Amino acid sequence: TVFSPDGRLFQVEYAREAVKKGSTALGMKFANGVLLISDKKVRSRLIEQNSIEKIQLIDDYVAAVTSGLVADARVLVDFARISAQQEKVTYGSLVNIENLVKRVADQMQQYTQYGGVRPYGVSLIFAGIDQIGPRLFDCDPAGTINEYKATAIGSGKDAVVSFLEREYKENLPEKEAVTLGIKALKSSLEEGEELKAPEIASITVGNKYRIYDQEEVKKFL
């Protein structure tokens, strides 16, 4: 990973191409809470649907979704889980989720500066609750971070983001936020493609994460 004459790092831009191939996922903040929704390219009745989930708990209060190279993503989630526990052991709690996201992002930044390694082909959304409130961040192959009220990653990102730029409202009730999220995800599907059942997870201030089961998600389809 070296600079081109225009100051670009092409190996990082190419890692971002891998991310674009992943299934669409989104996050959004709502009244006293945050949620994640993830589409899945479920491809065979022979797969176990309940396994290798797109939404992964980092701890009881923080979850992540990823897009891009799936093995790379697992390594970064493993890193995030261990880094969260190190912080909890050191201080007793995780006060600001942004610092955890930064640590993950720094791990990714390193793999764009040192020779002998390629960048991670992964983008992540982290969502959870900390002492500041409900938080929503994304992180890309370069280790670039942004905090959002709503955001998306993966192949359908641009459609989902355009939809949200128009339709998103702050401080919605959870149910209405989920409905809007499902609508946003549908808007990104190709000619007559049907949304077959995404993963949904949500958290509200003073509670731990809730993972929706299939039957609850169906009530939004």
Binding site: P5, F10, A142
Partner: protein
């Protein structure tokens, strides 16, 4: 304003302009080519069945002139339509750089096959290159035919020549120019089909060879 000058160019030759050509090519053009090839084949069969004498040097066959004229007319249309596609791409070749050239490579590759169509397949240039002239007959086939026949006619008409092979050569000119139309229409059909496929597979990068997404900075 320089941006305005560029915008005016691009607004005057859009993807719609080039797509309209490809649509015409996929339908009416290939059909007209087919009809020319059938007409050439009928003319060839008529000549194969013929015995030639001095009377055949006294008149230029109108059936053959018609086939060649029709072929020239088609070639003319294809040439001008090819230039529309060439224009749409060439005015969107972006700032010259030593990087971010993956779409530029697409533009060059499709321009190359359109150039081969115009220059080699249609034989539109006034002199062919060191590569020769791979097409069985070019755009100026009628002039080619008239030139070749006129030379043999003058020889036969005069004190006319007594060579038996010269008389068969007159017939063979008539036959060969029809065969050359049959061969050239086939050859041309392949090229047109190859370009329809190439355009439709690559059109997005042909119009937008670079996509801006500078997310690393601020």
């Amino acid at each position: 304003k320089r941006a305005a000058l560029i915008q005016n160019l691009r607004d005057s030759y859009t993807e719609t302009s080039s797509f309209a050509v490809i649509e015409e090519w996929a339908a009416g053009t290939l059909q007209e080519i087919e009809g020319i090839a059938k007409a050439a084949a009928e003319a060839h069969g008529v000549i194969r069945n013929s015995t030639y004498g001095r009377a055949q040097a006294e008149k230029s066959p109108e059936q053959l002139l018609g086939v060649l004229q029709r072929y020239q007319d088609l070639c003319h249309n294809v040439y001008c339509q090819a230039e529309t596609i060439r224009t749409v791409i060439a005015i969107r070749i972006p700032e010259h750089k030593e990087e971010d050239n993956l779409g530029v490579a697409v533009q060059h590759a499709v321009l190359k096959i359109i150039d081969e169509l115009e220059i080699k397949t249609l034989g539109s240039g006034e002199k062919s290159g060191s590569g020769g002239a791979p097409t069985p007959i070019g755009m100026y086939a009628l002039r080619e035919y008239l030139s070749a026949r006129s030379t043999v006619e003058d020889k036969l008409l005069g004190g006319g020549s007594q060579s038996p092979s010269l008389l068969l050569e007159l017939r063979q000119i008539d036959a060969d120019f029809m065969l050359k139309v049959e061969l050239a229409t086939t050859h041309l059909s392949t090229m047109v089909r190859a370009v329809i496929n190439a355009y439709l597979l690559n059109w997005k990068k042909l119009i937008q060879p670079r996509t801006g997404s500078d997310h690393m900075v601020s």
